[PDB]
Amino acid sequence: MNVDLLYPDPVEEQRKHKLKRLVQGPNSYFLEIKCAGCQDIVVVYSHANTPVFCPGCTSQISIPTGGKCAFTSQVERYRQ
Amino acid sequence: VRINVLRDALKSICNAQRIGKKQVIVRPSSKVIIEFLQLMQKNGYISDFAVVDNHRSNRIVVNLIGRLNKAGVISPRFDIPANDIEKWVVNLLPSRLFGHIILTTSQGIMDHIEAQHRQIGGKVIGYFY
Amino acid sequence: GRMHAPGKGISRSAIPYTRAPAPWNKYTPEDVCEQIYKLAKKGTPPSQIGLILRDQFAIGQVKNVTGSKIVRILKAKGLAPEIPEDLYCMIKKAVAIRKHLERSRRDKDSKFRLILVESRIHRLARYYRQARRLPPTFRYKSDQAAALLA
Amino acid sequence: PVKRRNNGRSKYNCGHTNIVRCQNCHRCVPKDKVIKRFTIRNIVDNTIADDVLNACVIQGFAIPKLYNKVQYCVSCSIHNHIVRVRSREDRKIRTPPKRFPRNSSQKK
Amino acid sequence: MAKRTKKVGLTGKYGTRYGRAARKQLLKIETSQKAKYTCPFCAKDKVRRTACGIWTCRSCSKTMAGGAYSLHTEPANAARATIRRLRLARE
Amino acid sequence: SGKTSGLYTARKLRTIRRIQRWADKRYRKAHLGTWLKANPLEGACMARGIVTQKIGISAKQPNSAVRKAVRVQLTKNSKKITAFVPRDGSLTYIDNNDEVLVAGFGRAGRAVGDIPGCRFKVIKVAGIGLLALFLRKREK
Amino acid sequence: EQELEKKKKEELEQRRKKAEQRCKERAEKVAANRLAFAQTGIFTEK
Amino acid sequence: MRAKWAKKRMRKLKRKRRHMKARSK
RNA sequence: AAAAUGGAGA
RNA sequence: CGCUGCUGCAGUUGAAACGCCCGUAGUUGGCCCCCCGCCGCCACGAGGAAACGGGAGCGCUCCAGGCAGGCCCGUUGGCCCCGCCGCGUGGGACCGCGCAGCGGGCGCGGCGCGCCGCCGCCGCAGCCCCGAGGAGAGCGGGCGGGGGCACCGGUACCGGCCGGGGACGGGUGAAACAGGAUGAUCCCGCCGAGACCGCCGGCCGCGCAGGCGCCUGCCAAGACCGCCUCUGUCAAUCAAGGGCGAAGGCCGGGGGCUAGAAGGCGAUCAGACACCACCGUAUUCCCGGCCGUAAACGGUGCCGCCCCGCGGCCGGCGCGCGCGUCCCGCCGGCCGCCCAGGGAAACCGGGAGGCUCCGGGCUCUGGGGGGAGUAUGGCCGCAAGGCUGAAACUUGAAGGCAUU
């Protein structure tokens, strides 16, 4: 079976540790979210540590959990 | 903690070759481990190598010819005069046919054979069987 | 080694490989500078400064957007912390731990942490005394540790 | 000459445990070295179950089922034959033998 | 300081005499006798022993009928809560 | 063994060697310095002296016969130590106080073979070798 | 000794020391004094 | 348990010496 | 339930 | 005799990892800045008395010897020694450390120039590598019989109280010691303290270890995982120095339900000092101190690295999936069996492997079996005891794991 360490295979890399990969890279992303009422775009980390409130609505659009940040309003996928 | 990178690389390369895996990784690239690896490639024990580079320690991926019998390090470096180079060949080299001890001399870093012929003796970084 | 504690874990995270700025880069590097001081004006310590900038605003990496550290823009600006937050917070922890120990002395185990945290504080501060961060005279003591907040 | 890797105990990530005394020996034993067979037995003997069931004054009555734990000491277990010393091959067999899924203290 | 290294300092006022058992027992009791405990109402540690049994706190200006050698003798301290238990149970 | 190895660690190794040198029974024997004072012989091949009471020490096992030895006070240290006589029936020659030289049993301290509790061995009596007295090579 | 503390403050003042405006002359600078980076026509310098 | 009944015997021997050393002096 | 020896040395 | 170990030894059971953790010197610190300067460092000289030894030539009747010999190198006796830790000469690989912004002009600013001044002066791209599967701090979320302080609910056990009823009760291996018609045992209610937290309760989990299990709360944390959060080597092991540390013991109180060192009995056996029954004091429980030891054991110090696969359990965190505690990884820890490899073996193999092809770092410990943890000093404790620690002499095995 042909598997080569020098040229790293991207499919396995995702399952691998953020540090164990041939290059220790970020494993999280910035996601803009769509407030249903207004079209202001708020960028949020894939894992949020501090709450970001949608501009014009005082209530935080993201209540942080240990990893993924859920959103009270509908979610804009990643960057789209 | 990790003081000797070459011992963690030498047993990295030797252990991998023992299982027969040609491609091996090394946690930190060192300009001195570059010297041992390229003197291994130069003598033909090891094959084409590469360092995937982050901005940090860097990881070394080396393909092997599969012929390595033994590699190792003398920790820490002990300096021998060019007069005593041969006593160290007796203890750490199997035979005088495939003898190679990595010496460090100010005028270039070479294996034992070339150095004594150049009449300069420095410190034994690591053993190469 | 997790320092004094035996338990071993890898909890580090990987920042972006590009040393230069991220592509979206909603603001200007210059725009980034005024937000950081504003956090000194809001009173956010430097560790918390990066965290809030990271999610509240698009900026996630400081060096990529501007060639400096959270503290180096602040150090040039008026608010430069003499006691780095990593020591200020640990001194804060010793006082808080002392409060449990004074209220109840039967807790030998909490006393072990108050002994561990004092020892960590001493090691970190020997570093900042040899460097220029903390004055050579600065010495951790038991009574004024509360006042060191000032 | 270590006899068993477990050392007669299931202690893992631990240093000390509670002591439960043998019903027979009365010898204190740490929870780890105690047999702990759990036994379910009907309160009446099976032989007179029929006549007592025949005396079913209340409707749909069922026999009193008792749930208890038996914890003999190591020495109590061998002499009362709860378990038997076995050979090296038999040492790792993790099951009680003679099937018997029958619900009574006596295996019958 | 620490003029007499041995712990028998309050009772160092006796000297070589009076044995080694009595002097040690006295050290614990005597220190308790002159100790400043906290009067309940004053809540300040200003109490001393006026005479065996009756203790008073300077600030609170109140006299508490405590023990001979301590504001709260250990047995009474318990009886306190046992009366409270029966009482709370009564109604 | 942990071993402490570094280019600047000639201290740990120097103390350790000095301290752990005196662990062997043999090393301590020659390096404590007790043995020269302790031995009845002052570390010599032979010691002159005068003979004292003769002695009949029971043997152990297998050997099961009394072996006649003579206890002699060495003149130099004024101490009395017993010396095993040489060959068959050689003790009859030795009786009252006479000039006796005593020598080691090879072991140098341990009692020779299976005759228990005897550390030294007589080699001469009067002025004639006691192994010649036995063969009548040289005798009074 | 307390007076010499004031003297130490004096020597510090001559050093650049606190120049908050110089660090904050970035975002404020990008609004007013930014030069030819987008549509400004004054490219030539010195 | 011979080791226990030797060690504590040794301690009883050690104590006897203390009285003998002091009372005699 | 009790239940103690077994001289030396081939 | 690698049985003194630097090369080059052992410490899971032969002899041997401190009970545990912090900690100062000491030792050791990842990548990494080519070029400069010091370190160390080798090459490599100068000048370093021989004898002696390595070693020219030489036949005492042959060497061992000696430096003589003959028509002869100006015939000899050549040469290597000496370690000389310095001193030159050069390399700079490795090795550790390096600060003051440079620079120009005035400058020959005295047989040549420097100091030092005085000038932003215009030549400065003048100026903060990196962000370690180093560590510290931070934040989000769960994590746990983890800790203290209150609080409190059960049952049991024992001791009372009333009522009932009717001779036996206890105890065992059988027996007996002491219970009982002033009514025991027994059966229920009512109660009083004092401990204890049942089944659930585990190749579960926690914690620096000793250790950790009532209900309610309350206080300070710890580890963990996740992160485009700063800090920027603050690191590792650590004499001296500390802090803890089960039980038992001790020192004063408080407490006293059960077990129960002593002590008493009965019953055993030629003795029963005991084992076993029946009492029973100290103790056990709490508070304030001392002790500072355990088969404190995983009989295995710590921090690192590389591994051979198959499954569990716990902690997060992602992975798609008809969304089910579904799968699949990242896992940090708990582990079972085990592949090479290792081992005197037993066995280990999330190592006790990578190692007679014997050299990551760092503390500790051992050197035949006794004597001996003894003697003698010092230190510690109130004492018990701890801690440190020889010899005189003995004598041939002591021991380790395994095969019948």
Closest-CA residue in chain B for A4? B23
* F5 and B CB contact within 8 Å: yes
- Within 13 Å of residue D101, how many CA atoms lie on the same side as its CB? 0
What residues contact C60, with CB distance under 8 A and at least 6 apart? A30, A45, C16, C22, C53, C54
Resolution (A): 4.9
Are the beta carbons of A32 and A76 closer than 8 angstroms?
yes
CB pairs under 8 A, 24+ apart, for B14-23? B14/B68, B14/B70, B14/B71, B14/B72, B16/B64, B17/B64, B17/B66, B17/B68, B20/B66, B22/B47, B22/B63, B22/B64, B22/B66, B23/A4, B23/A5, B23/A6, B23/B61, B23/B62, B23/B63, B23/B64
What 3-state class would DSSP assign to E54? strand
Q: What is the distance between the alpha carbons of residues D23 and E32, in angstroms, rounded to a whole number?
A: 50
Q: What is the distance between the alpha carbons of residues D70 and C141, in angstroms, rounded to a whole number?
A: 59
Q: Which nucleotide is nearest to F62 (CA to C1')?
A: I9
Q: What is the 3 state secondary structure string of B51-115?
A: EECCCCCCEEEEEECCCCCCEEEEEEEEECCHHHHHHHHHHHCCCCCCCEEEEECCCCCCEHHHH
Q: What is the 3 state secondary structure string of chain D?
A: CCCCCCCCCCCCCCCCCCEEECCCCCCEEEHHHCCCEEEEEECCCHHHHHHHHHCCCCCCCCCCEEEEEECCCHHHHHHCCCCCCCCHHHHCCCCCCCCCCCCCCCCC
| List of chains touching F (3+ CB pairs within 8 A) | B
Q: Would you list the domain boundaries of chain D?
A: 1-96
Q: What is the distance between the alpha carbons of residues E26 and F89, in angstroms, rounded to a whole number?
A: 83
Is the Cβ atom of F5 within 7 Å of strand I at any atom? no
Across the interface, whether the CB atoms of G27 and C33 are under 8 A apart is answered yes
Closest-CA residue in chain A for C49? A50
CB contacts, 8 Å: C68 with chain G: none
Method for this entry? cryo-EM
What 3-state class would DSSP assign to F104? strand
- Omega of the bond leading into C23 within 30 degrees of 0 (cis): no
Across the interface, whether the CB atoms of G20 and C73 are under 8 A apart is answered no
Across the interface, whether the CB atoms of C51 and A30 are under 8 A apart is answered no
Q: How many residues does chain B have?
A: 129
Is the Cβ atom of F65 within 7 Å of strand I at any atom? no
Residue B128's beta-bridge partner residues?
B71, B100
* C25 and G CB contact within 8 Å: no
Residue C119 parent element (H or E): helix C108-130
Give the pairing of strands F79-84 and F120-125.
parallel
- Omega of the bond leading into E40 within 30 degrees of 0 (cis): no
Distance in angstroms, CA of F2 to C1' of J393?
37
Residue A74's closest CA among A39, A28, A47?
A: A39
Q: What is the distance between the alpha carbons of residues E49 and E71, in angstroms, rounded to a whole number?
A: 8
Q: What is the distance between the alpha carbons of residues C70 and C68, in angstroms, rounded to a whole number?
A: 7
What count of other Cβ atoms lies within 10 Å of the Cβ of residue F53? 9
Q: Kindly tell me the number of DSSP H helices and DSSP E strands found in chain C.
A: 6, 0
Residue C52's closest CA among C35, C71, C28?
A: C35
Is the Cβ atom of C31 within 7 Å of strand J at any atom? no
What 3-state class would DSSP assign to B49? strand
Residue B127's closest CA among B88, B79, B82?
A: B88
C7 is in an annotated binding site: yes
Distance in angstroms, CA of F8 to C1' of J235?
19
First to last CA, chain G: 51
Q: How many residues does chain A have?
A: 80
Q: What is the distance between the alpha carbons of residues B89 and B97, in angstroms, rounded to a whole number?
A: 11
What count of other Cβ atoms lies within 10 Å of the Cβ of residue G24? 20
Are the beta carbons of D35 and D77 closer than 8 angstroms?
yes
Are the beta carbons of F58 and F94 closer than 8 angstroms?
no
What 3-state class would DSSP assign to B29? coil
- Phi first, then psi, for residue D76 (nearest 5°) are -65, -40
Across the interface, whether the CB atoms of C33 and G19 are under 8 A apart is answered no
Q: What is the distance between the alpha carbons of residues F133 and F91, in angstroms, rounded to a whole number?
A: 10
Find the residue closest to J27 using CA and C1' atoms: F9
Residue B119's closest CA among B79, B80, B82?
A: B82
**Rounded to a whole number, what is the distance in Å from the CA of C26 to chain G's nearest CA?**
13
State the sign of the Cα–Cα–Cα–Cα dihedral C56, C62, C68, C69.
positive
CB contacts, 8 Å: B52 with chain A: 8, 22-23
* B1 and C CB contact within 8 Å: yes
Q: Give the C-alpha distances (Å, rounded to integers) separating B105 from A44, A67, B42.
A: 56, 54, 18
What 3-state class would DSSP assign to A60? strand
Tokens representing G22? 């110089």
Q: What is the distance between the alpha carbons of residues A39 and F23, in angstroms, rounded to a whole number?
A: 85
